[PDB]
Structures are given as C-alpha cells and as structure tokens.
Ligand binder design. Structure first.
Ligand SMILES: N[C@@H](CCCC[B-](O)(O)O)C(=O)O
Ligand SMILES: [Mn+2]
Ligand SMILES: [Mn+2]
Length: 308
C-alpha cells in the first residue's frame, strides 16, 4: 500500500478560489509526515503547477472549461505515472473537477477500477443539465460511458474518454441532488446510498453492500473520491457547498477504515477543502483535521489501535 502524494492546487471548477490552497493546509497540517508514523512508504510528487489560461470564455454557460480540462488532463498523466510505479495515488486537490483527470488517468493503468464517491452531491451534471456552469458538479458526467453521446464538446476536454460504467460506481452520503442529476441516477441505474439509506441501514450495512457491489465477482481496484462536504458541516465547515444532515466524523472514519481493510485502495481524492471559507480560525483546523484523519484511515490508522 505505497503512497504517491499528488498535489492539485486547482480551483477554476467553481467560484470561490481558496480551494487551490488546500494541498498546503493539509501538507502543513502534517499529512505526509503523519503518514510516515504508519508503515507508509511515501513519495511526494509535489504540487502540480496549473498555469492559467487567460483566454477562457464560457462555452455556453460552462465556466473555465479549457482551464479545467487542461488541469484535469495534466493530473491524468501524473496519476497514471504514480500508478505505473506501484503506488496508490493521493490527490490532495482544489475543487472536485480534478476527479475527471484523477479517475481518468487511474483507469489508463487500471481500467477495471471501481469508484466509491463520498459526497452530498452526485456531481453528475452534463454541460446541458447543470444550471451554474461550475465544472465541479459535472465530473462524473465526463467519466461515464453510458452518457458519452450526451456530453457535448466542451473546449479543453478532447483528451477525455469515458472510462467507467454506471455500474462501476457507488454514491454514499447524498442529500443535495438536482432534478437533472436524479433522472440520470435513476435512468442509468447508478447504485447509491443517500443519507436516507445510511439512516435506514446504518453505515455498517451501507459499507457492506457498497464493497460487495464492487468486489463481488473480482477483487478489483477501488477509487475513493472523497469530498469533505459529504461529512456534516459541523466537522468540515471550510468547504464551498455545505449541506446539513451529513455523514458524521465517525461514519467518515468508518467508511474509510473499511475501504482500507480491502487492501484494494488504489486511488484516492481528498477534495474541496477551503480554509478561507472558515468563518473562524478553529473552523479551518477542524476541516483540515477531519480531512487528515480520513486520509490516515484510508492508509491503516485504526480506531481500535495499531501495533508493529
Ligand atoms: N449541482 C450543483 C452543486 C455542485 C456541487 C459540487 B461538489 O460536490 O464538488 O461540492 C452545481 O451543479 O453547481
Ligand atoms: Mn463533489
Ligand atoms: Mn459536494
């Protein structure tokens, strides 16, 4: 379970911009260092410099498409790289649009990967369903095979090619899903566990089924794209789109303690942490701390204890 820290200080996937200064708060909070206290082999590929694109006019109402499509394309090759090194890719990111390039490059080296998406939103808006233009709520849209042919030609993404099927992804923690997104959910038959199902089943059963839905016929690679807003705002408040009634600190730790234990963690994304959105000093450290703990759990830190 070797690690390949990959920093993606990107933000042009939504309005607020301090999200790109996240690989910093995390890195400085002690991430890579605390990972060493664990039997983790860690190699930091440094922060990915995402040069700006000055000339990036809206495509229809889709914002910074070329800036977003390039930074995702940039990450795709960088993630493919650490993956072709026998390392789990750790993507400390800015916004969640980077999951287009994150999952994409992972699939290049591992086309049989299953995606586990922890979020309050499904982020499955097509350039035609979305009503905000923020590309951070459309990433799953560019990634699914079923929908290609329904995904227009947004400038900057011609390097993309649907890598996963609707049946290779699960959603945990949904509580804010748009009408266009819900129809794509039900239509393509995407398996998901919104907050209603976590409430009915308990995260224990929720996690049992998720993994069994993904590793039932073959023990295939798992891609955990974790959005900190999946967790309730009382834990990770320094985030762009917070919704009440979210996953608890403990459920945040339970989801990842279980995933780790499969030994199949292959790729991970810690997205949407924005310090500047913390209305107070301890709001930023509580978001970053909850983000560091989710990461450590993904790599072995167990609440019951650990011993050499
Ligand atoms: N569906 C809204 C919200 C997106 C939420 C994105 B996320 O998961 O990265 O916080 C939009 O399309 O702009
Ligand atoms: Mn998201
Ligand atoms: Mn979200």
């Amino acid at each position: 379970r070797t690690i390949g820290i990959i920093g993606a200080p990107f933000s042009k996937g939504q309005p607020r911009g301090g999200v790109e200064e996240g690989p910093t708060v995390l890195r400085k909070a002690g991430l890579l260092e605390k990972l060493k206290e664990q039997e983790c082999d860690v190699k930091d590929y440094g922060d990915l410099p995402f040069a700006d694109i000055p000339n990036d006019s809206p495509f229809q109402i889709v914002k910074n498409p070329r800036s977003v499509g390039k930074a995702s394309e940039q990450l795709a090759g960088k993630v493919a790289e650490v993956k072709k090194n026998g390392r789990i890719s750790l993507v400390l990111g800015g916004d969640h649009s980077l999951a287009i390039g994150s999952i994409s490059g992972h699939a290049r080296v591992h086309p049989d990967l299953g995606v586990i998406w922890v979020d309050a939103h499904t982020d499955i808006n097509t350039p035609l369903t979305t009503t905000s233009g923020n590309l951070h709520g459309q990433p799953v849209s560019f990634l699914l095979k079923e929908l290609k042919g329904k995904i227009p030609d947004v400038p900057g993404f011609s390097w993309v090619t649907p890598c996963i099927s609707a049946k290779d992804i699960v959603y945990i923690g949904l509580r804010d899903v748009a009408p266009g997104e819900h129809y794509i959910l039900k239509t393509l038959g995407i398996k998901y566990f919104s907050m209603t199902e976590v409430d009915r089943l308990g995260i224990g059963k929720v996690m049992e089924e998720t993994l069994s839905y993904l590793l039932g016929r073959k023990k295939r690679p798992i891609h955990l794209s974790f959005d900190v807003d999946g967790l309730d705002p009382s834990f990770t408040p320094a985030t762009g789109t917070p919704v009440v009634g979210g996953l608890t600190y403990r459920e945040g730790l339970y989801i990842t303690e279980e995933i780790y234990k499969t030994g199949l963690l292959s790729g991970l994304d810690i997205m949407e942490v924005n310090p500047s959105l913390g209305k107070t000093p301890e709001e930023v450290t509580r978001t970053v701390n909850t983000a560091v703990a989710i990461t450590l759990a993904c790599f072995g830190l167990a609440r019951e204890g650990n011993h050499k």
